[PDB]
Amino acid sequence: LMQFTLPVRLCKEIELFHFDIGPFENMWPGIFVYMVHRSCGTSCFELEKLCRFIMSVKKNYRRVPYHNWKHAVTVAHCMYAILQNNHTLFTDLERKGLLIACLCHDLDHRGFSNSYLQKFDHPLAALYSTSTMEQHHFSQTVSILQLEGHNIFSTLSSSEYEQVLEIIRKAIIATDLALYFGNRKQLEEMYQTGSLNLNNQSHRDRVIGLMMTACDLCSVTKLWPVTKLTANDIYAEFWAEGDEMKKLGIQPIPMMDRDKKDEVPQGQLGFYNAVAIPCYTTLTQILPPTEPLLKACRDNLSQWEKVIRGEE
* Residue 105 assigned to a binding site: yes
Candidate residues 28, 116, 271, 304; the one interacting with ligand K7O per rule CB under 6 A: 271
Candidate residues 99, 103, 207, 220; the one interacting with ligand K7O per rule CB under 6 A: 220
| Alpha helix (H) residue ranges in the chain | 8-13, 28-39, 47-59, 69-85, 92-104, 114-120, 123-127, 132-145, 158-174, 180-192, 201-216, 224-247, 264-271, 277-286, 291-308
Set 18, 37, 67, 137: catalytic member: 67
When CB distances are held under 5 to 8 angstroms depending on the partner's kind, the choice from Mg ion, ligand K7O, Zn ion, none that residue 234 binds is ligand K7O
Using CA atoms, how far apart are residues 65 and 290, in angstroms rounded to an integer? Answer: 28
Supply the minimum distance, in Å, between the C-beta of residue 77 and Zn ion. Answer: 13
122 is catalytic: no
- Nearer of residues 176 and 216 to Zn ion, judged by Cβ: 216
User: Within 13 A of 226's CA, how many CA atoms are on the CB side?
Assistant: 19
Supply the minimum distance, in Å, between the C-beta of residue 205 and ligand K7O. Answer: 22
- Nearer of residues 44 and 210 to Mg ion, judged by Cβ: 210
- Nearer of residues 94 and 106 to Zn ion, judged by Cβ: 106
* Residue 106 assigned to a binding site: yes
Judged by CB under 6 A, the number of residues near ligand K7O is 15
Site membership for ligand K7O, residue 65 (CB under 6 A): no
Cβ-based neighbours of 160, under 8 Å, separated by 6 or more: 93
Site membership for Mg ion, residue 106 (CB under 5 A): yes
Cβ-based neighbours of 304, under 8 Å, separated by 6 or more: 265, 268, 269, 272
Distances (CA, A) of 179 to 171, 230, 280, 299: 12, 23, 16, 26
Helix-helix angle 201-216:69-85, to 10 degrees: 130
Site membership for ligand K7O, residue 278 (CB under 6 A): no
Site membership for ligand K7O, residue 217 (CB under 6 A): yes
Q: Taking Cα atoms as reference points, which of 95, 97, 116, 72 lies closest to residue 215? A: 72
The binding site for a divalent metal cation comprises 71, 105-106, 216
Active site residues: 67
Q: Give contact residues for Zn ion (rule: CB under 5 A).
A: 106, 216
